[PDB]
Amino acid sequence: NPQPVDTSNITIPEKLEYFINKYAEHSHDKWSMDKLANGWIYGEIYSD
């Protein structure tokens, strides 16, 4: 039985919000670079 531990009994510290932001630019940057490497094109219109 996969039992992830309960999560409602904890709250995110406020000091970690800046941290969450930073790792999110980290992830966005790596996602941008690797999709550019794979061939995803950058532009001003959304065309899959």
UniProtKB/Swiss-Prot annotation:
Subcellular location: Sarcoplasmic reticulum membrane
Record's comment on post-translational modification: Channel activity is modulated by phosphorylation. Phosphorylation is increased in failing heart, leading to calcium leaks and increased cytoplasmic Ca(2+) levels.
Tissue spec. comment: Detected in heart muscle (at protein level). Heart muscle, brain (cerebellum and hippocampus) and placenta.
Origin: domain of life: Eukaryota
Induction of its expression: By TGFB1.
Stated family: Belongs to the ryanodine receptor (TC 1.A.3.1) family. RYR2 subfamily.
Quaternary structure note: Homotetramer. Can also form heterotetramers with RYR1 and RYR3. Interacts with FKBP1A and FKBP1B; these interactions may stabilize the channel in its closed state and prevent Ca(2+) leaks. Interacts with CALM and S100A1; these interactions regulate channel activity. Identified in a complex composed of RYR2, FKBP1B, PKA catalytic subunit, PRKAR2A, AKAP6, and the protein phosphatases PP2A and PP1. Interacts directly with FKBP1B, PKA, PP1 and PP2A. Interacts with SELENON. In cardiac muscles, identified in a complex, composed of FSD2, CMYA5 and RYR2.
Role, per record: Cytosolic calcium-activated calcium channel that mediates the release of Ca(2+) from the sarcoplasmic reticulum into the cytosol and thereby plays a key role in triggering cardiac muscle contraction. Aberrant channel activation can lead to cardiac arrhythmia. In cardiac myocytes, calcium release is triggered by increased Ca(2+) cytosolic levels due to activation of the L-type calcium channel CACNA1C. The calcium channel activity is modulated by formation of heterotetramers with RYR3. Required for cellular calcium ion homeostasis. Required for embryonic heart development.
Disease: Ventricular tachycardia, catecholaminergic polymorphic, 1, with or without atrial dysfunction and/or dilated cardiomyopathy: An arrhythmogenic disorder characterized by stress-induced, bidirectional ventricular tachycardia that may degenerate into cardiac arrest and cause sudden death. Patients present with recurrent syncope, seizures, or sudden death after physical activity or emotional stress. CPVT1 inheritance is autosomal dominant. Ventricular arrhythmias due to cardiac ryanodine receptor calcium release deficiency syndrome: An autosomal dominant arrhythmogenic disorder characterized by syncope, cardiac arrest and/or sudden unexpected death, often in association with physical exertion or acute emotional stress. Patients who survive manifest polymorphic ventricular tachycardia and ventricular fibrillation. Unlike typical catecholaminergic ventricular tachycardia, arrhythmias are not reproducible on exercise stress testing or adrenaline challenge.
Domain note: The calcium release channel activity resides in the C-terminal region while the remaining part of the protein resides in the cytoplasm.
Protein name (database record): Ryanodine receptor 2
Taxonomic classification: Eukaryota, Metazoa, Chordata, Craniata, Vertebrata
Residues of the full protein shown: 2702 to 2749 of 4967
